[PDB]
Every structure is written in structure tokens, then in C-alpha cells.
Amino acid sequence: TVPLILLVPKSRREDLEKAQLAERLRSQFFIDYGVRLPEVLLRDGEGLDDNSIVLLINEIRVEQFTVYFDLMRVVNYSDEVVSFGINPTIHQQGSSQYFWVTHEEGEKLRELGYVLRNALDELYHCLAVTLARNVNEYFGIQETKHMLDQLEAKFPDLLKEVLRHATVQRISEVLQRLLSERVSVRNMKLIMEALALWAPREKDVINLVEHIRGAMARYICHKFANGGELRAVMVSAEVEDVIRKGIRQTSGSTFLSLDPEASANLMDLITLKLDDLLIAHKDLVLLTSVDVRRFIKKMIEGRFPDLEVLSFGEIADSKSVNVIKTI
């Protein structure tokens, strides 16, 4: 490994050491995603204002976050909150907007049903999301091969079934593709049984990952729910069909071929439908049909890298999906 670095404000460093942000971060990441982060060091950022954090991977600034350490974030913010006389501190970051309120104001809003989050939990969800996306930077063949060792000491026969049909390279690619889209690989037993089933059937890694995803529907659903309702923006049959109608294939696998204008137009619709929502992209997902899920993720990720895209198959067996807008 090389270490992950969090540049933090001079004024906050002491509390962050005392809170053990560095290590708790790694622990919770393991609990959520089933993989080892490298060591995380804190370092004082020169000219960071008191509510800024910066992440460095390989000593290159990767993203800056605004977390108001003394305040609480309203996660399902609506404008109704202003009706209770609370005027939030607002930060605009990408085309997401974030609303922060005092501890006091926060307790009042909790009892009206709002879900509030502290600065450190928030900071973790932000780092988790960026690190899930940057999985290739610290997770590859060596770590895969080490996860397999741990699995072989429990389930040797299943490890061997999977290897009759997939190389260690291939399985690492699968795990990376799951994790890059924020799907946990903490249940290597289940994932392997799913590779056991599909890997002989499917020699295209992209198609394989989609079948593993289908097989893991219930787990993906539970994870994006947290311990609460799953907030979904539904992609309409209309948008779905422009994508479906663009799907091509020459010899290798299957790809999206849309006019430049056709894609820019789809993007303007998504953009503006999301601008109507007060909720941060990373607390939402998009729902769409199984065959177009991956195309929409490829299409939107350059611009909305936080917004994941679940298929309707992946939520069939959920209780608390809440569709809050259509596209």
C-alpha cells in the first residue's frame, strides 16, 4: 500500500486524532464493503478553512469536501424546514446542494421526521463514495488473491469450482466492478456461488457482473437502503426506449450508440429533473430496466459520479423503495 491522506484544518486536527477518524474510517469501510483500505494519515492543510477536508491518493488531490464539523446535515431536506423558522447553512458542490443546521435545530427537526446526520458520518459517506469509485487505486490482484485465501480456509470446494471457470485476474475485475458502483463484496461466499453459477455461462466480464448483480439483488437493495427507506428517481419508459433503441453490437460486446444530440438531450432532462430535488445525489439512486442499467450508468457518470443506477430486478424484493421523481 501507499497511505491515503486527509488534509484537515489546523483548528480541527486535535479533535480528529482524538476521535480516531483515521482508523474508524478504515473499520467502517471494511464493515460496509469487505475490503481493507490502506492506512489513512491526517495532515494539516495550509489555508484550509475550518470546514474543509481534502483527500489525496498517491499524493494527488482527488476531491475536496465541505463538512461543517459543528453542524448537522438534514439529509431529506425540504423547504418546509424554513416554515419552522430554521434557515440552514447551504453548500453547493457539483449540482448537489447540502443543508446544515445547528444541533439544536437538528433535534427539533428529528421530531418532525427529518433524518439528520453528523459531520463525521457525513464525511465518511463522502469519502466512502469517492473511494468506492477509486477502488482500482488500492484494490487489485494481490488483495483479491488474499481474500480468496481467507475464503479457501472455510470453503475450499467452492473456491475450486469458481477457478475451474474463472481466473484470479477475472474475479478481481468482477470485485472491482461491483465495488466501483458501491456494491459491497463483504459476502464473498455469496458472490462466489453466483460466479459458480454464471462464470461458465458468461465469458464477457461486463455481462458477468450484471448477472452477479441479479443474483445479489436482495443484498444490493438492503445496502442502499441503509436502515431506512430507499430513495429512487425512476427513469421513464420514454427515456428507457431511446437508450434501448440506441443499443448496438458489431463483434465483441454490446455498446450504446446515441447521436451526440440525442445524448445531450437525455442529459439535459436528467440534469433538470435532479435540479428540482433538494437531496444529494449520493443519497439517491436511479431505477431502470435490467438491460439498460449499465448504459445509463456509463452515460451519466462523467457528470454525476455519485449517482448509482439500480435495475428494477435489484429492487423487486424490497419493501421500502420510495420513488420521489421520474425522469
Side-chain angles (χ1 to χ4, degrees), residues 2-327:
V2 136
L4 289 170
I5 296 193
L6 300 179
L7 296 189
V8 304
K10 216 190 298 317
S11 72
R12 306 283 179 184
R13 171 64 169 289
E14 168 144 333
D15 310 335
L16 299 168
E17 306 299 10
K18 191 186 315 197
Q20 304 168 69
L21 182 65
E23 289 302 337
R24 290 164 76 205
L25 178 28
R26 302 177 77 248
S27 283
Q28 183 69 42
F29 197 85
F30 193 82
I31 290 160
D32 294 330
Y33 299 97
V35 293
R36 208 116 101 287
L37 288 191
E39 84 171 317
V40 170
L41 300 171
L42 307 190
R43 165 185 303 177
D44 293 351
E46 216 147 303
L48 283 190
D49 81 25
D50 296 309
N51 303 122
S52 312
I53 292 288
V54 180
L55 165 80
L56 280 65
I57 305 183
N58 308 335
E59 301 272 13
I60 302 186
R61 289 193 182 204
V62 162
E63 201 169 310
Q64 173 153 335
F65 308 93
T66 294
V67 176
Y68 292 87
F69 299 105
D70 314 317
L71 302 174
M72 303 288 272
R73 199 194 145 218
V74 183
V75 173
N76 54 356
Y77 183 80
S78 63
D79 281 324
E80 167 179 317
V81 162
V82 167
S83 299
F84 297 86
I86 293 177
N87 302 116
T89 293
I90 305 173
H91 183 65
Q92 229 273 313
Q93 185 117 37
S95 52
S96 288
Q97 268 199 319
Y98 297 84
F99 302 90
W100 295 77
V101 289
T102 70
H103 279 104
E104 179 181 43
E105 286 164 348
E107 281 321 81
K108 175 161 115 143
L109 298 174
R110 276 215 217 262
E111 307 196 321
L112 299 150
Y114 292 97
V115 168
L116 275 88
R117 190 180 291 171
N118 64 55
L120 296 195
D121 291 345
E122 176 55 16
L123 181 68
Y124 166 83
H125 286 229
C126 292
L127 297 161
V129 149
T130 307
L131 293 162
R133 181 161 67 241
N134 287 282
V135 53
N136 293 358
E137 293 302 300
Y138 58 85
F139 183 79
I141 322 298
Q142 267 278 70
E143 300 75 36
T144 297
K145 142 75 182 141
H146 183 89
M147 292 176 79
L148 296 192
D149 290 339
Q150 230 63 27
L151 181 109
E152 197 194 343
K154 287 182 273 173
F155 304 122
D157 297 311
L158 174 69
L159 174 59
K160 286 163 181 173
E161 176 62 25
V162 183
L163 293 182
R164 299 183 111 276
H165 301 309
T167 65
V168 177
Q169 167 70 255
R170 168 59 43 106
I171 290 159
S172 73
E173 284 163 35
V174 169
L175 293 185
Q176 294 171 329
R177 281 164 180 288
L178 290 176
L179 272 163
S180 76
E181 295 202 66
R182 268 157 61 202
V183 174
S184 175
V185 306
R186 58 131 79 167
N187 194 333
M188 193 60 32
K189 190 196 161 176
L190 258 227
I191 292 171
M192 292 283 153
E193 273 159 350
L195 283 158
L197 202 65
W198 288 101
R201 253 102 80 62
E202 196 54 73
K203 290 312 182 211
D204 185 295
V205 60
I206 292 313
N207 283 8
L208 194 56
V209 164
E210 302 304 306
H211 285 289
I212 307 316
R213 282 183 67 110
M216 296 283 302
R218 166 188 213 67
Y219 286 88
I220 291 159
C221 214
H222 216 259
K223 186 238 173 34
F224 280 98
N226 260 283
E229 89 183 18
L230 176 33
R231 290 193 205 79
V233 178
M234 197 184 278
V235 170
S236 68
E238 282 55 46
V239 170
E240 201 175 287
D241 210 56
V242 176
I243 305 299
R244 209 181 316 289
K245 224 145 171 283
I247 294 182
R248 247 39 147 210
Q249 187 252 311
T250 33
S251 285
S253 73
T254 221
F255 55 83
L256 180 67
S257 180
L258 269 181
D259 255 10
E261 163 207 63
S263 40
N265 172 76
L266 257 39
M267 288 298 308
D268 304 335
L269 173 68
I270 294 172
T271 296
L272 66 76
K273 282 287 190 82
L274 293 173
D275 282 32
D276 292 330
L277 295 189
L278 302 165
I279 297 165
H281 303 155
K282 66 194 141 72
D283 297 313
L284 302 186
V285 305
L286 254 66
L287 305 185
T288 198
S289 279
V290 46
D291 61 349
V292 313
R293 196 207 62 88
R294 205 214 170 5
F295 298 121
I296 289 146
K297 174 69 203 193
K298 287 294 312 280
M299 190 183 328
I300 78 185
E301 73 182 0
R303 197 135 110 205
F304 301 123
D306 289 343
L307 179 60
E308 309 302 341
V309 176
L310 306 190
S311 111
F312 297 111
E314 292 167 7
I315 69 148
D317 147 75
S318 158
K319 319 134 237 178
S320 191
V321 178
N322 174 18
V323 180
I324 57 160
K325 216 165 198 265
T326 319
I327 284 161

